[PDB]
Ligand binder design. Structure first.
Ligand code: HEM
Ligand code: HEM
Ligand SMILES: Cc1cc(N)nc(COc2cc(CCN3CCC3)cc(F)c2F)c1
Ligand SMILES: Cc1cc(N)nc(COc2cc(CCN3CCC3)cc(F)c2F)c1
Ligand SMILES: C[C@H](O)[C@H](O)[C@H]1CNc2nc(N)[nH]c(=O)c2N1
Ligand SMILES: C[C@H](O)[C@H](O)[C@H]1CNc2nc(N)[nH]c(=O)c2N1
Ligand SMILES: [Cl-]
Ligand SMILES: [Cl-]
Ligand SMILES: [Gd]
Ligand SMILES: [Gd]
Ligand SMILES: [Zn+2]
Lengths: 401, 401
């Protein structure tokens, strides 16, 4: 039962919830591997059993009549068909828990406010595209972003998987150039090659929005173009540095992760895209300044006429801070929801206290909760954390190709 | 079973085969990761044997004459007395290897340049004090800082204990009020409470260099007044915000860690203060800007006429970069050795590649190697790392009371 200290205030709690940790992680007492980014009918039953207990515990009918039937229904249905179907209420309850259990998510103060779309009756890549366009449309909401998840038909024996090949619903093309370089986003060179190979006529800008590659079961992926007027984008400008808009930088409003597997009570939904709103550092710091991403840091500092020959001038840090300022200003100007890493960490601390009262702890991967700049300026820096895996959960899964 | 370790800036891959040697066990289990937590008889022969076998390999004397010979003397030394004394070169070799194995030290590229003063024949606090004072004056070197460590007599059973009560050789006072809140450094409130109890006259400053509380075996502590000309300090000023000097800020030159316990070949030296030189973020970001330390961030932001009303202004981030610029600037002006976090982390990557070729890996705790500001702007953010306990080593130790 770990003792967890917060160093800002001095408080101490004990994460009793870590004992309920089911699936095991990559660390042992010999060696910690926390900083690594990427770490049968009877067991389907005990996961299903556990989830149904969870569900009924949340509705205050733990141990009741209905409880007994469900357990009995799920067993007899596994025995009969090898699997079982979630009810709608149980599905909504499991999308929410999966978010509440994501240790690398800082936005989890919002976990109970989640719009779940049941698309488990989906039938084709063409229906799949329609459900997605409506997800984007509802989540985006003209800049007043809302959290949503669309759940496509679960993995099941006999049929292939529904898969979204794109890591996110909105990605920018990454074209490998002549001289080995990359135009656009380098994290998406591969999805870009696949889209071309499947008949997408490429562009050559730095911010070409990628088509969707949508895989129906036992089917090749099919190419679908997003309507331009569905993808709300924000041009990036600086409140005081007016040469900044001459960079032509843009980002998109809607962060919608689309390649993660959703796990509920032993069942697996390999296509369940979810979306919220951005924190300024993900765009400002990571997407635009990462040396393997758009890598603008140098060009900004040169424009700012900072001294880039030496590092002790902290030109990197000065340029980066104004790149974030610009992201926050641009998004509020465009009236698109956005949260800065101070407010986001502040309110994640409020999540951490709400969680301690409710379950006795909270899965949190420190290295992902602390923002990529100004770490120790936020309060999550000084909070010790305990990293474990609870189910329901979003897990990574391999690329379908 | 050789952990795959990736660098995400470049995409390179290495395997840490050194992690297999981890004798002492850390705090993580497959159930939960505790990496972000700060803290948690003739077996002595096995520790002494393996340490000796390191030594002779490091001098290409694996399996020859003196190798077996020295092995015999340990066997016999312990057989007679129940403990043993280190050949002075082994003391030097283990002092350097403990530094080389410190997972949380980002300055380990300097590990081979360590001055080891041998204080093993010490008896009395007045004796320590001079061993300490020679260390301080050697390492400071009029501001040309030099890594040094002084090794006071190892612990043996039935004996007392050499302990330096201060967490560091140079610590600022912290004074409580008719309203509680601290003037000076709140991290040192306690040792200031002790220093006064043992008769020290309290000052009224926010940068009052504490006395020392040195303690010899089986004896109470003795206060020691450090000579002011030995405590080299740097007044803080900012190159272009001329009011910064007016704030009255200072920090000292010598980062000197007393209260940690050297552990070599099964011997335990509870008094073994080491020293090197500062990285600017330790001073500007941690010591001056932590909410539980001096916490000057809002004060500097007022003076910059920043909009502290909203957090999306990134006033915290802006003021912090300037506080760091002033620390770098001030140390460079005083001709005192200092290193910024971009220079430091880039030198630590040159360390990891060095260590790959040499020992097949390196133990590194990611959360302390990444700087407390601008983390993703430094290359070590993008480097996966593995944390484990090699020996020799510096360990945390309980307070001597
Ligand atoms: C609405 C505001 C939200 C904010 C501010 C937010 C913030 C973040 C951030 C900064 C990360 C780390 C990103 C990275 O890997 O660099 C993250 C990860 C994650 N988020 Fe959230 N998120 C939000 C909503 C959601 C929603 C609605 C879901 C699911 C329904 C979700 C699920 C996850 C998961 C599973 C991860 C871990 C995967 C990973 O980071 O690699 N988040 N979130
Ligand atoms: C020469 C320049 C050096 C630099 C720039 C440097 C820098 C750092 C920094 C920034 C930390 C962060 C840990 C924290 O903030 O708590 C650290 C930890 C540590 N360093 Fe170094 N260091 C240097 C030399 C040394 C030497 C000479 C030794 C011992 C021989 C040493 C041993 C350690 C240990 C044991 C820790 C972890 C203990 C702890 O942080 O509680 N370092 N160092
Ligand atoms: C719903 C939601 C809201 C929000 N605000 N942010 C996210 C980001 O989620 C993710 C981002 C990535 C890419 C991470 N790379 C490091 C920098 C880019 C991978 C994932 F698996 C995520 F889950 C998701
Ligand atoms: C030799 C050396 C060189 C260098 N440059 N820095 C150091 C600091 O090491 C340490 C710092 C602290 C204080 C921690 N404070 C809370 C946040 C800061 C405690 C330790 F136990 C250390 F070991 C040591
Ligand atoms: C290798 C390193 O652990 C990796 O870059 C991690 C560190 N922390 C992170 N934290 C967040 N929020 N997002 C990330 O992508 C990462 N990357
Ligand atoms: C909770 C967290 O692990 C803890 O505050 C650590 C994080 N990283 C740190 N890094 C350094 N250099 N110094 C520290 O005190 C800490 N504190
Ligand atoms: Cl993103
Ligand atoms: Cl310090
Ligand atoms: Gd301007
Ligand atoms: Gd003024
Ligand atoms: Zn761990």
């Amino acid at each position: 039962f770990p003792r967890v200290k917060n160093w800002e205030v001095g408080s101490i709690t004990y994460d009793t919830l870590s004992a309920q940790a089911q699936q095991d992680g990559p660390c042992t007492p010999r060696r910690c591997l926390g900083s690594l980014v990427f770490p049968a009918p009877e067991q389907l039953l005990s996961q299903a059993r556990d989830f149904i207990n969870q569900y009924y515990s949340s509705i205050k009918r733990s141990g009741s009549q209905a409880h007994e039937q469900r357990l009995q229904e799920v067993e007899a249905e596994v025995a009969a068909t090898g699997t079982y179907q979630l009810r709608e209420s149980e599905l909504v309850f499991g999308a929410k828990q999966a978010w509440r259990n994501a240790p690398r998510c800082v936005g989890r103060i919002q976990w109970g406010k989640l719009q779940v779309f049941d698309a488990r009756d989906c039938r084709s890549a063409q229906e799949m595209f329609t459900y997605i366009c409506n997800h984007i449309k509802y989540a985006t909401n003209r800049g007043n972003l809302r959290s949503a998840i669309t759940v496509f038909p679960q993995r099941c024996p006999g049929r292939g998987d529904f898969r979204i090949w794109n890591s996110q619903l909105v990605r920018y093309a990454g074209y490998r150039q002549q001289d080995g370089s990359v135009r656009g986003d380098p994290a998406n060179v591969e999805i870009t090659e696949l889209c071309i190979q499947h008949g997408w006529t490429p562009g050559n800008g730095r911010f070409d929005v990628l088509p969707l590659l949508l895989q129906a079961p036992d089917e090749p992926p099919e190419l679908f173009l997003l309507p331009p007027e569905l993808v709300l984008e924000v041009p990036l400008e600086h409140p005081t540095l007016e040469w900044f808009a001459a960079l032509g930088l843009r980002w998109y409003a809607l962060p919608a992760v689309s390649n993660m597997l959703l796990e509920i009570g032993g069942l697996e939904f390999p296509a369940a895209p979810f979306s919220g709103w951005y924190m300024s550092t993900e765009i400002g710091t990571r997407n635009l300044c990462d040396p393997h991403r758009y890598n603008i840091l140098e060009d900004v500092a040169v424009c700012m006429d900072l001294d880039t020959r030496t590092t002790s001038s902290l030109w990197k840090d000065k340029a980066a801070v104004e790149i974030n300022v610009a992201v926050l200003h641009s998004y509020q100007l465009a009236k698109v929801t956005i949260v800065d890493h101070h407010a986001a960490t502040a309110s994640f601390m409020k999540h951490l206290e709400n969680e301690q009262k409710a379950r006795g702890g909270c899965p949190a991967d420190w290295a992902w909760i602390v923002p990529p700049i100004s770490g120790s300026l936020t309060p999550v820096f000084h909070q010790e954390m305990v990293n474990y895996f609870l189910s329901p959960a979003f897990r990574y899964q391999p690329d379908p190709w």
